[PDB]
Ligand binder design. Sequence first.
Ligand SMILES: CCCCCCCCCCCCCCCCCC(=O)OC[C@H](COP(=O)(O)OCCN)OC(=O)CCCCCCCCCCCCCCCCC
Ligand SMILES: CCCCCCCCCCCCO[C@@H]1O[C@H](CO)[C@@H](O[C@H]2O[C@H](CO)[C@@H](O)[C@H](O)[C@H]2O)[C@H](O)[C@H]1O
Ligand SMILES: CCCCCCCCCCCCO[C@@H]1O[C@H](CO)[C@@H](O[C@H]2O[C@H](CO)[C@@H](O)[C@H](O)[C@H]2O)[C@H](O)[C@H]1O
Ligand SMILES: CCCCCCCCCCCCO[C@@H]1O[C@H](CO)[C@@H](O[C@H]2O[C@H](CO)[C@@H](O)[C@H](O)[C@H]2O)[C@H](O)[C@H]1O
Lengths: 171, 174, 347, 115, 48, 83, 318, 97, 97
Amino acid sequence: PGIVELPSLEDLKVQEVKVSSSVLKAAAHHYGAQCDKPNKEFMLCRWEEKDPRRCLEEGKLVNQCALEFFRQIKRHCAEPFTEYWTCIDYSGLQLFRRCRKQQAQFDECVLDKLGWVRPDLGDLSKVTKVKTDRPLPENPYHSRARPEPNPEVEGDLKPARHGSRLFFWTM
Amino acid sequence: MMLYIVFILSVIFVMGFVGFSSKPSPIYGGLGLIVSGGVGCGIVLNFGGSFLGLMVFLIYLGGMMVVFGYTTAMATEQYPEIWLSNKAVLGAFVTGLLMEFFMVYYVLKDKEVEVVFEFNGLGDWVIYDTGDSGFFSEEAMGIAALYSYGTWLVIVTGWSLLIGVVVIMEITRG
Amino acid sequence: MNPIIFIIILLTIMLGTIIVMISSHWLLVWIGFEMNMLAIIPIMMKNHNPRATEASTKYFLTQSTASMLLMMAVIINLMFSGQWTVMKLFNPMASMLMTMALAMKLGMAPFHFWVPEVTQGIPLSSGLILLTWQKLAPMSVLYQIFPSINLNLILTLSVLSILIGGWGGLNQTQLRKIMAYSSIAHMGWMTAVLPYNPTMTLLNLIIYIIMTSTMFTMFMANSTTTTLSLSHTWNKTPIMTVLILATLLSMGGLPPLSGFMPKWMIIQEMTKNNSIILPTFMAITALLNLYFYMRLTYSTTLTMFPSTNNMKMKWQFPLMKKMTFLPTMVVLSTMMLPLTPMLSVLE
Amino acid sequence: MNLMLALLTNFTLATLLVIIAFWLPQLNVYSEKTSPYECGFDPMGSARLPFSMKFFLVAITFLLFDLEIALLLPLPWASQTANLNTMLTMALFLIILLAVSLAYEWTQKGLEWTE
Amino acid sequence: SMMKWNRERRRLQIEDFEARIALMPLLQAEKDRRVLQMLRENLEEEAT
Amino acid sequence: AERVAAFLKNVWAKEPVLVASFAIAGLAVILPTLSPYTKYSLMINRATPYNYPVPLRDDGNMPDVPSHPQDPQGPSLEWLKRL
Amino acid sequence: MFMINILMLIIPILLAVAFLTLVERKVLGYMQLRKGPNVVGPYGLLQPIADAIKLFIKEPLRPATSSASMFILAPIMALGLALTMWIPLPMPYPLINMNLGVLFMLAMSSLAVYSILWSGWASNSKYALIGALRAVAQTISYEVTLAIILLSVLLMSGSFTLSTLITTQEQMWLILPAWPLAMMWFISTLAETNRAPFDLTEGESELVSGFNVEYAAGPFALFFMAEYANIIMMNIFTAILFLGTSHNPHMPELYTINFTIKSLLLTMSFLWIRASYPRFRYDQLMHLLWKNFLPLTLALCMWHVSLPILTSGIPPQT
Amino acid sequence: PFFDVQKRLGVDLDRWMTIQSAEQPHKIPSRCHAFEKEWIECAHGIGSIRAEKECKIEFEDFRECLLRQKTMKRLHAIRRQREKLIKEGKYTPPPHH
Amino acid sequence: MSMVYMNIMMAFTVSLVGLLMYRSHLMSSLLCLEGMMLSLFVMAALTILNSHFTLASMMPIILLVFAACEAALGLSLLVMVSNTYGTDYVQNLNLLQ
Ligand SMILES: CCCCCCCCCCCCCCCCCC(=O)OC[C@H](COP(=O)(O)OCCN)OC(=O)CCCCCCCCCCCCCCCCC
Ligand SMILES: CCCCCCCCCCCCO[C@@H]1O[C@H](CO)[C@@H](O[C@H]2O[C@H](CO)[C@@H](O)[C@H](O)[C@H]2O)[C@H](O)[C@H]1O
Ligand SMILES: CCCCCCCCCCCCO[C@@H]1O[C@H](CO)[C@@H](O[C@H]2O[C@H](CO)[C@@H](O)[C@H](O)[C@H]2O)[C@H](O)[C@H]1O
Ligand SMILES: CCCCCCCCCCCCO[C@@H]1O[C@H](CO)[C@@H](O[C@H]2O[C@H](CO)[C@@H](O)[C@H](O)[C@H]2O)[C@H](O)[C@H]1O
């Protein structure tokens, strides 16, 4: 029944964004705005291909845009950003509402230096269009040809020939 | 050993069933059923059904409490029978445990066992889902859909419970 | 029982049957069965005497056990198919459990022991519900799962039901036990043709219900529950004895009466499938049913048993029972053979 | 694990206390000391004799009411549905039918204990 | 008071939910590589 | 209206517990119909994003679908910010 | 470090229970115009220790007619389950953080009932049996009302997590929007803990000592400890449910101080109520719950289902 | 159903729960969603007599997803062999396995 | 199948044999009926939970609701049987032989 095709370990290797979840959570809102385009294309690929092997290349562009995003924070906002996720990291639920003061410092730092604006409530949950050159998959389910339907019984309905024809009955 | 958590609970599950299926005094049959409800809750909990597990335990705890009251009124004799006090009860109890033990022994001795039908003894973890990162419980969304999706189910269940009150009063009004 | 309570309970019995018949989901079919059993027990217990209590307990234990096996089949079907749709079952072990579960609910042999006793223990009106309406829901489920029923199992039950129903009726003097054993025998014909043509199962079911409803209604009219109590009917209502005679001969399958039709149609279907030994055996064994129908016509209509002096007091009072639909049912029970081709409506 | 550890410690401590209670004290056991208690005079019959339940009908109704909570306990989650029009109707429907069943048993004297 | 606080809690929930949505593309890409690596490692051991 | 008052006052003296229950039960059934806020409850439940907002493949004629989350197109939660 | 945490939970509970018995005897003493323990230790402070030592060196008895295994099993469940009820309590951090802590306590509390049923039954004596069946009656009275009362409160919290009740009550105690439920809940906890005026399973003046009349020495002590541990736990639960303490994540001790004071005062009120009222008749307890609390709880349940929707105040799932 | 009142009246009383490929709350998919849909679409409209024979592949794959019987047999074969080779001092697992 | 199914299926069978092999107390048999529902509940829950079929997560709950009705119905009959004969013994229910 076939040998599952798995990629090589070199085709899977990539630079990893090795930061904690509190770091990702602290930068999530700005990260969503800055790296929207590579991310949206990759997510369009997964829900279209339905195959992790068919989306590897777009999945590397997701990391390369994440590393570039975190490299800009380090160049200009390292200290204000470092206080903020530290405050997030303390919380057992990593709550935003317990770190509003430090969130501000990081928010005007990225605005003054990088020009970044925080998305509004509801922005990041919008369904957005995305242009791509990847052709639309044609048989993403790998479906076989379906069986043909039963040939339709049509025509004009006429009375039963000699009625029921049940034993002796003449009607 | 801990990977076999669900299997170990299921072994105690069957043992509880042998407890009340052997049919000693309903005082002890109720005890057996409480145990089975407990490890039965544990089994379902380990599959991700915390709400389903805790509720079957809760419902059966109230039910056996009513059973205990009814036993003292209508199913009690001078010498209530324990599993060791009767040959028929002990014989059934012993038979069920030996039939349970041997099934366990082979499936553990071989990682598969055939008891009428083929069962794999690799542990129950192997069938679990690998990925999961939704920010909710799936059982809760499914159960909560009873009120949006299950409009028809609520009507028939609500009616049956209402009729149940009417019926039990007719039956018990001699 | 308050009249309003009786109607609501009675409507719930019908509601459970209707839920089974319109449900496309195995859970709702099981719910319909539970709703039906919940509402029928209080009708069984209506008169609150030890016998009625025994019948209700024996009925409850039997129907509860069947529901467990039925639900077990549903869950096994779910494991091996991942779906709940009411249709063929995808596991042979599930098919056996459901088939046996439905067999108990119907009272088919060898799961028949409860039918004679429950029927004898409850009033005639309750027995009418038990032997007619309660057949609809299990039969309607069998009508949908038959493609996956094991042929040997279903035919084995049919043959046993016809034999055990035929022999059981010979020893009965109580009219409710005669109707129970007669019911067991007739259920065998319905399931015997089920694998071949389900339409003839519906035809046999409807005609059985019309003829059984008529007999119970005539027993209620004169408040007779024994062979000897029925033997006095000639001395109060001569017309009733003649209707009992015609209906009983029809139940025995004698042409040109309506009761011959389902037996006639079922033999046709079985022979079309080159099944010759079984319809021949079935038709002959049904002669046992005719024998103990003929005894009732002897003691009821064709002879006159002794009366009692007090019977003269009943000559001065008219029947006041409702006898709902009795004139129509008896005509349908007897004079429908000329209209046999109308069975295509059931298609 | 933590939960299993916590449960084992709780019932392990309780068992240890019972063990200590049974093996530390000096015991003097004889028939009169261990005879059943009943205010100084010997019990008249077996305590295993049937004990009539006067609230038997309430006890069965508890089984039916005790399953209403399983149907109602999901309500906090159901309140998060998009289809709130259907929700609220069905939630109110169940509670009303539960209230009606209670009223029926009440008005028909089902909650009165038998004498 | 309960009305006003619970509205704020719903506003806070959405914010929390939007952060997860922003990171889901990155986590999904990591998950795909991690699963494939594990399977490829499994495949090699099976060969020997 | 006078007959009901006597009954209503009579039950306030004999069964105040049941009078309070039916009143509260009545309010639970009626007020949701007459409340101007009931509409917002479903909108807030609608606006909570449990799932990923899967993007659409742009075909060229989607004027109202935004290209970026911060674009003006798309549903806005300004009504919720002020609720 | 988790085993140490378990011991830091259950050893203090047994110490608090020990000194609750002293505080009960003193508080009732002064409400009764007397003093209560003040000889054994200064201000009676060593009285609980003396009582504890005395019971565990007293001779235990196995009644001749008793069922041995259930006789011994019953006190072990009683204390084991009483301590288990504490593992999910957020003080402010729970020992075990459960998604469904509220339902876990409902299940454990139902299981703890059987420690009464089986001790009374296994005793094989009439006064023990009468007490045990009062426990059956008492559970039937309050269990249905108790769960629905909780459900109404949780419709404002949005979760079955006990820690979420702290977040729900950050701006205001839930006793304000739900004092009718707090009233019926407070009564239900007295019935649930077999506390006066609902101390019926023991019922000294009617049943000598009720379900545990045949228990002596250490096995008796376990039942007594379980009762008083349940008194404190149910008042902590009441405080968390209706008198939420603000939690500062950087100063969690301040939560524990205010939280403890509320629980002490609620526990003190249990003693205060015991000194004030006569005992119910146990069929009057059933009618109180079923004919009064249940109709009102069912109505308030519908009200609290509708109120968040009609006011657009539905809480979050988290 | 025996009486298809649901189709006639257009009401939907219980079809919503019948299959795991139907619309779920928040679009949570079942584990075997793809396998079910393929089998349901293969057999649609052609009847059980034909479907039993012309959709065996789709059904057989769907059954494998549901109960995983072939997979578990394969794993038990691999695990059993490793026990043989580990116990004979023939193969040694790498650090990560 | 998975190994848990072996014991859950065995549990159903044990209670089924328990119900079919009566003793004297009718109450003992009513427990074997609640035993069958408990195993049916558990085995349904495992299948539904494992396969991630969300909408049927309510199915085990509905199963318990109609088990409660049966137990309440069964206990009601036991009350009337006991009130007649003074015990719940099943050998007393033989008037209809
Ligand atoms: C056309 C296609 C269909 C073909 C199928 C066959 C059609 C016939 C089906 C018959 C259906 C049942 C209806 C029969 C009507 C009978 C009417 C009758 O016989 O007279 C009744 C008579 C009443 O006696 P009386 O006291 O004077 O009046 C009281 C009533 N006001 O009663 C008596 O007094 C008689 C008492 C003595 C009993 C005599 C019994 C032997 C004679 C019975 C004849 C009827 C046989 C019916 C059996 C079926 C025959 C095919
Ligand atoms: C009255 C007592 C009731 C007790 C119920 C006990 C539990 C019953 C379990 C029912 C399920 C058993 O399932 C039974 O065994 C295995 C299951 O993979 C199947 O095994 C067989 O069938 C399938 C069909 O494709 C193939 O794997 C192959 O033909 C063969 O292995 C059987 O066809 C099935 O009938
Ligand atoms: C004996 C049987 C007894 C059956 C009793 C059944 C009682 C049911 C009473 C109706 C309860 C719901 O009543 C109905 O609730 C919804 C809110 O969810 C309201 O709907 C309102 O809010 C919703 C969302 O919250 C909006 O989408 C909608 O635009 C708005 O109309 C209806 O205006 C109101 O009429
Ligand atoms: C939607 C939830 C809230 C709605 C309330 C739902 C519960 C309604 C409970 C039933 C109310 C009417 O039904 C009830 O019937 C009995 C008849 O025995 C009446 O009368 C009886 O009640 C009281 C207390 O038992 C006795 O003092 C009185 O002697 C007796 O006549 C009650 O006064 C009435 O309250």
